[PDB]
Amino acid sequence: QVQLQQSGAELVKPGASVKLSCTATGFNIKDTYMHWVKQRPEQGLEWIGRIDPANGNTKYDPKFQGKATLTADTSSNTAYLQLSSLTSEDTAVYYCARKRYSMDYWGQGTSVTVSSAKTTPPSVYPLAPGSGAQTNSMVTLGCLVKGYFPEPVTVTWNSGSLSSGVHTFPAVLQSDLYTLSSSVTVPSSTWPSETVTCNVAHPASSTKVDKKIVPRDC
Amino acid sequence: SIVMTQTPKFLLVSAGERVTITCKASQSVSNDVGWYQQKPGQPPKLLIYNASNRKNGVPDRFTGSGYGTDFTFTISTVQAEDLAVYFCQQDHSFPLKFGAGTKLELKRADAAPTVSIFPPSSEQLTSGGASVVCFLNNFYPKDINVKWKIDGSERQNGVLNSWTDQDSKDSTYSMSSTLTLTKDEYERHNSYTCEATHKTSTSPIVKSFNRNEC
């Protein structure tokens, strides 16, 4: 019955401000300490600070004094982390946690990206096998998601129907644009006889693209 | 400013062995030490309450012990679902500090990759760019090399490689290699080759296609 609901992802220009919401359920916020944790990509966890919702007492790690301001509203049982003076070093996922009697529960986390680069929708390219490709029991199909910013994008195959043989690869940043690929391996008796479609979503640009894997036509 | 130093950063272990993660508090912390597990893409999950007290619904193979400066997290028998990054935490002094983390990696027998090569899509050719994609799937160990050859000539520019995290189902890795060129350069040449050199075989695993065919 205890869950922490965090706000959606944010892309902000450098020097801007952001406010994140952590809505709680199953426990009143004033009987516990709410904590916020920062995790830079491919890095560790950094304790930002702790808020006492009953009285408003705030203790921050000395590195987060001005950047992070923690405010709580007991009426909505919602804890807030405000991040200002944002730079690229603030690009991270921010979690909210509840701590009381050495007990902990964490939210899903909110991704904040700080960059001057503009939002760029991806280009989704179906990757069918070569025209003279080898025929076997299984056939591998691909999907290329190129030239998008910011992260993340979500890739699904046949709206979740195909999931066993999917390898979605981490994105690579180049010239302020991300590119990733996804592969799905299906039995050759099921393609092209059955449909295989690449479903790509890029929430930051409100982009949802479906690209069916059609055999190459010469 | 009680700093927690966590070792090792990377723990290469075999299934059925025992992993011990050590976190050293710079000053005395005593009871207020917690151990967290973070599966990829997931929030960290608490596993040890007060340096020896498992929370609940936690496999009894996850143990913790220590007092003062020395603290230890031990996994009795490493399993596939234990693939994650583990963090120690100190809540004794309010400047709360986490450990740097320990990335657990499962050891398994060498597996050869399944190499697939894909020509640039028809739609992308209208865009003015051409990306040749090579998939290397289900291989171990993680370290592997990909060589791109165009009409027999090795190409080292415009290549982006991306490794997947270890798959808990089979403890393997997958990698994607993308060669990006201009449309004019792609249409200039015909033979494009992806070569995979791995610890499994001294000879490279080769996949190729010809552009003058479709």
Residue numbers in the entry:
A (entry chain H): 1 to 52, 52A, 53 to 82, 82A, 82B, 82C, 83 to 99, 101 to 215
B (entry chain L): 1 to 214
Question: What sentences appear in the manuscript?
Answer:
pmcα1-Antitrypsin is the most abundant circulating protease inhibitor in humans. The most common severe deficiency allele, and the most actively researched, is the Z variant (rs28929474; Glu342Lys). This mutation induces the formation of ordered polymers that accumulate as inclusions within the endoplasmic reticulum of hepatocytes and circulate as functionally inactive molecules. We have previously generated monoclonal antibodies (mAb) that recognize different epitopes within the α1-antitrypsin polymer, including the 9C5mAb.
Polymer flexibility and the relatively small and featureless constituent ~50 kDa α1-antitrypsin monomer subunits presented a challenging target for cryo-EM structural analysis. This was partially ameliorated by using antibody-derived Fab domains. The crystal structures of 9C5Fab alone and in complex with RCL-cleaved α1-antitrypsin (referred to here as AAT:9C5Fab) were solved; the latter localized the epitope to helices D and E of α1-antitrypsin. Fab binding at this peripheral epitope would double the effective molecular weight of the monomer subunits from ~50 kDa to ~100 kDa, confer additional visual features and possibly improve the rigidity of the polymers to assist with the subsequent computational alignment of images. To facilitate particle detection and determination of orientational and translational parameters, monoclonal antibody Fab domains with known epitopes were used.
